[PDB]
Design a protein around this ligand. Sequence first.
Ligand SMILES: *[C@@H]1O[C@H](CO)[C@@H](O)[C@H](O)[C@H]1NC(C)=O
Length: 135
Amino acid sequence: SCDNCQPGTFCRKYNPVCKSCPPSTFSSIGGQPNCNICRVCAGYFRFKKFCSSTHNAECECIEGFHCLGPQCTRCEKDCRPGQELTKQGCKTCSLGTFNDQNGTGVCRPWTNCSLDGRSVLKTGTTEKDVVCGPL
Ligand SMILES: *[C@@H]1O[C@H](CO)[C@@H](O)[C@H](O)[C@H]1NC(C)=O
């Protein structure tokens, strides 16, 4: 009987009624005995999308932070030089690659100085490219 109810309602099998979900509460599937609690977005989080009767609120991260996980359940500090922002958060550049930008950019590979005739003056790290000699 309660299976005839649609999303944004709750319904108890002993007394079938498709009652609207109360405030700050939702249900994406209809006709369950209770509605789920709305997620509040505060502190490091802000609302991307407000809660409605049929779907949860979605959170976003404040300035200087980015979302971590599929439901943005954690914020992570924006990455430092020597790191790139992947879809799974900040990953340190692997051996042979670098990034010199703060809070942006991607891990590029080191300049091979011997593509020209040039020699290496300075070795490479995760934050600095190798420096080559004279052309
Ligand atoms: C640079 O290029 C040479 C010539 O193809 C290659 O053999 C070597 O592995 C490279 N070396 C570095 C340090 O990238």
